Amino acid sequence: LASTRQDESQSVEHRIHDTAEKVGAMSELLEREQEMV
Amino acid sequence: LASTRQDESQSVEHRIHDTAEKVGAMSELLEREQEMV
């Protein structure tokens, strides 16, 4: 199971889905922090 | 060899894999720097 989960983790369709959530978190944090400072 | 490596560097499946690591580094650095300031 570990080998299959890492092999599907090395795919394209998973990695776009990861970067979307990461960019969303960065955008919200950037806006909230810029508001504070 | 140099021509083939730059031609595969101009692809889609490589470039998504590059942007994922770059966004991850930016997110971790943003969180650590926001913690410090």
Side-chain angles (χ1 to χ4, degrees), chain A residues 1-6 9-12 14-17 19-20 22-27 29, chain B residues 1-6 9-12 14-17 19-20 22-27 29:
Chain A
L1 289 180
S3 68
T4 60
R5 75 184 70 186
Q6 66 90 28
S9 177
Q10 293 293 319
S11 179
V12 176
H14 181 76
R15 192 165 292 182
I16 298 169
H17 295 171
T19 57
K22 197 174 265 78
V23 170
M26 288 180 68
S27 69
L29 192 143
Chain B
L1 289 179
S3 68
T4 60
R5 75 184 70 186
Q6 66 90 28
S9 177
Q10 293 293 319
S11 179
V12 176
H14 181 76
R15 192 165 292 182
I16 298 169
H17 295 171
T19 57
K22 197 174 265 78
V23 170
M26 288 180 68
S27 69
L29 192 143

